[PDB]
Amino acid sequence: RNILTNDEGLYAGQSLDVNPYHFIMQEDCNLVLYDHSTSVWASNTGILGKKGCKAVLQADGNFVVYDAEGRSLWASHSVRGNGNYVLVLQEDGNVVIYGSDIWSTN
Amino acid sequence: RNILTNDEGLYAGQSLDVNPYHLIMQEDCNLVLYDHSTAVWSSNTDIPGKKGCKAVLQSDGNFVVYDAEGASLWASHSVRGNGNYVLVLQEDGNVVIYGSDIWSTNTYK
Amino acid sequence: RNILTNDEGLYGGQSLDVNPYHLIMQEDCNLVLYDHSTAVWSSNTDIPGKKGCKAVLQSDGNFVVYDAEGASLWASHSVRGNGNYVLVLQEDGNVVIYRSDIWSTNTYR
Amino acid sequence: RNILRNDEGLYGGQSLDVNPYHFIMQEDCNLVLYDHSTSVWASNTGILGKKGCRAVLQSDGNFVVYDAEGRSLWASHSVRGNGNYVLVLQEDGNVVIYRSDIWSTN
Ligand SMILES: OC[C@H]1O[C@@H](O)[C@@H](O)[C@@H](O)[C@@H]1O
Ligand SMILES: OC[C@H]1O[C@@H](O)[C@@H](O)[C@@H](O)[C@@H]1O
Ligand SMILES: OC[C@H]1O[C@@H](O)[C@@H](O)[C@@H](O)[C@@H]1O
Ligand SMILES: OC[C@H]1O[C@@H](O)[C@@H](O)[C@@H](O)[C@@H]1O
Ligand SMILES: OC[C@H]1O[C@H](O)[C@@H](O)[C@@H](O)[C@@H]1O
Ligand SMILES: OC[C@H]1O[C@H](O)[C@@H](O)[C@@H](O)[C@@H]1O
Ligand SMILES: OC[C@H]1O[C@H](O)[C@@H](O)[C@@H](O)[C@@H]1O
Ligand SMILES: OC[C@H]1O[C@H](O)[C@@H](O)[C@@H](O)[C@@H]1O
Numbered sequence A: 001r002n003i004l005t006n007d008e009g010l011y012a013g014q015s016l017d018v019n020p021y022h023f024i025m026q027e028d029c030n031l032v033l034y035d036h037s038t039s040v041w042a043s044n045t046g047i048l049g050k051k052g053c054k055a056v057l058q059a060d061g062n063f064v065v066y067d068a069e070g071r072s073l074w075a076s077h078s079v080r081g082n083g084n085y086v087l088v089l090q091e092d093g094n095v096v097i098y099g100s101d102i103w104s105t106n
Numbered sequence B: 001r002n003i004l005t006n007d008e009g010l011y012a013g014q015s016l017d018v019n020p021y022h023l024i025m026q027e028d029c030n031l032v033l034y035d036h037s038t039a040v041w042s043s044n045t046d047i048p049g050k051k052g053c054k055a056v057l058q059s060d061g062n063f064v065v066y067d068a069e070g071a072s073l074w075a076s077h078s079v080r081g082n083g084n085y086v087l088v089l090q091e092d093g094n095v096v097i098y099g100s101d102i103w104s105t106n107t108y109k
Numbered sequence C: 001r002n003i004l005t006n007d008e009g010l011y012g013g014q015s016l017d018v019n020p021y022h023l024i025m026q027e028d029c030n031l032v033l034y035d036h037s038t039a040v041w042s043s044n045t046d047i048p049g050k051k052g053c054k055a056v057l058q059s060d061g062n063f064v065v066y067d068a069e070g071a072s073l074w075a076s077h078s079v080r081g082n083g084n085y086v087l088v089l090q091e092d093g094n095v096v097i098y099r100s101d102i103w104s105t106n107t108y109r
Numbered sequence D: 001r002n003i004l005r006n007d008e009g010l011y012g013g014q015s016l017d018v019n020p021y022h023f024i025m026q027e028d029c030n031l032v033l034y035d036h037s038t039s040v041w042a043s044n045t046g047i048l049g050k051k052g053c054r055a056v057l058q059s060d061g062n063f064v065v066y067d068a069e070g071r072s073l074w075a076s077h078s079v080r081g082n083g084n085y086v087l088v089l090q091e092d093g094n095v096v097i098y099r100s101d102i103w104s105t106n
């Protein structure tokens, strides 16, 4: 993985890997960005044992984490209406949600 | 590779590969999108004698092609404005360009 | 749906349905064939910690189950080489893969 | 419908469908493929009043169109030995026959 396409997601354990940096949806609903092994960013919604979480980039541009019972845990709050967006784990360590198709090769 | 952050580009012979699909700046200045081994899209800039071209994504969102010192042969025309763009060769095939950051963690190095 | 033309794919939570039969790709990587409610065939992959898999009909004739950005969980082993194949969930229940084209009206679009 | 298995067929008026695509065995005895109302392919064996025809996919892998009695009018001539086959009307507007089976679950 490296980029999550429109309406794609990460289940518990799955992650976005690029160099020592890794964005992961942990065993507890906590999304973290690690530099090697040091946590540098997290959604801070961690609750030991609370598994079955999903992190999915919705079509409206919102990035939401969901509880096993489909409830919202945390949301990026981008939601710029319907379109085509992508979340990329950049090599410079940043996580960016670039939105709205500007061009396409058909 | 697989992506192109604005200001990054493909030189005379480099590619972006998402397995069946391919995007390569061949040696004849022609930038084409293959499917396995079947041309599906083209820049149409393989002028005879011309060589050493480059595909370049930019800050203004324009995906341009160039030859000997500047001079654009082709240029998508997706010049939306100065921002942050990326050209990605998707899993489905379609080569898309995404317009400016909507949200980030601002955790750059 | 009841068919997969060559390089198609059954993604997490998707199925092929015909009469009371159903070849559904469950949440867990288990590919199962039911008779409305009873399981009558299985890939056998209800693996703990394996969510979101995909069953896809390969171009080489092989039908395999893939992990989330993973590998071969299951395989029909029906590898016969590259051509055109198809998997169908028939009304007699039997799910079959048919080896390459013999005749076509050549009416592609 | 959209598939014809070993020894299945179309009687005068029957057809396979999938979106605006239509493979039909008309009362003219002419097998035709229609995009909407526009014809696209045909056997060109039509005769007004020539009804009672049946198109049948066979074990030898042959798609034969038969007369009201029981004689050959047209045939794909895809005879490639006894086996199992299918004729599908694909979502791309093409009609193909597939050589035998290579894998089945039951
Ligand atoms: O149209 C695409 C086609 O153009 C030709 O001129 C060559 O450059 C080929 O390599 C390429 O596949
Ligand atoms: O986590 C991505 C990136 O975040 C910034 O804060 C950097 O200073 C490092 O901590 C790291 O490389
Ligand atoms: O044998 C089939 C059977 O396998 C179990 O492990 C579960 O996945 C059930 O949902 C399924 O019906
Ligand atoms: O060649 C057959 C094919 O031709 C296309 O032009 C369309 O008419 C389709 O509806 C049809 O399936
Ligand atoms: O903030 C980083 C830290 O946050 C929580 O404590 C947990 O999710 C840990 O696994 C993680 O290392
Ligand atoms: O906070 C989560 C919530 O945020 C916004 O309201 C929307 O994007 C919803 O789709 C999402 O579930
Ligand atoms: O045209 C842009 C749009 O095209 C297709 O729908 C897909 O490739 C989308 O992922 C992409 O954003
Ligand atoms: O503000 C978003 C912007 O932040 C930093 O400048 C970089 O990570 C860019 O790639 C990103 O687009």
Ligand SMILES: OC[C@H]1O[C@H](O)[C@@H](O)[C@@H](O)[C@@H]1O
Pocket (backbone or CB within 6 Å): B058, B060, B062, B064, B072, B075, B077, B079
């Ligand atoms: O049309 C080509 C032309 O388009 C815009 O003006 C810019 O992207 C220029 O850099 C480029 O040369």
Ligand SMILES: OC[C@H]1O[C@H](O)[C@@H](O)[C@@H](O)[C@@H]1O
Pocket (backbone or CB within 6 Å): C058, C060, C062, C063, C064, C072, C074, C075, C077, C079
């Ligand atoms: O192990 C299953 C294996 O079967 C065949 O070799 C191919 O379809 C491979 O792609 C697949 O991985």
Ligand SMILES: OC[C@H]1O[C@H](O)[C@@H](O)[C@@H](O)[C@@H]1O
Pocket (backbone or CB within 6 Å): C005, C084, C101, C104, C108, D090, D092, D094, D096
């Ligand atoms: O030659 C038969 C072949 O024709 C085209 O390639 C496509 O419509 C395929 O689906 C089909 O199997």
Ligand SMILES: OC[C@H]1O[C@H](O)[C@@H](O)[C@@H](O)[C@@H]1O
Pocket (backbone or CB within 6 Å): D026, D028, D030, D032, D038, D039, D042, D044, D046
């Ligand atoms: O040849 C195609 C043409 O054949 C006959 O004329 C008729 O059955 C028409 O409906 C059909 O379109």
Ligand SMILES: OC[C@H]1O[C@H](O)[C@@H](O)[C@@H](O)[C@@H]1O
Pocket (backbone or CB within 6 Å): D058, D060, D062, D064, D072, D075, D079
């Ligand atoms: O040419 C028509 C003829 O072809 C083959 O011989 C067989 O399929 C026969 O059944 C059929 O009558």
Ligand SMILES: OC[C@H]1O[C@H](O)[C@@H](O)[C@@H](O)[C@@H]1O
Pocket (backbone or CB within 6 Å): C090, C092, C094, C095, C096, D005, D084, D085, D101, D103, D104
């Ligand atoms: O799988 C081969 C063969 O098996 C059974 O005989 C039936 O289900 C046929 O429809 C199928 O073609």
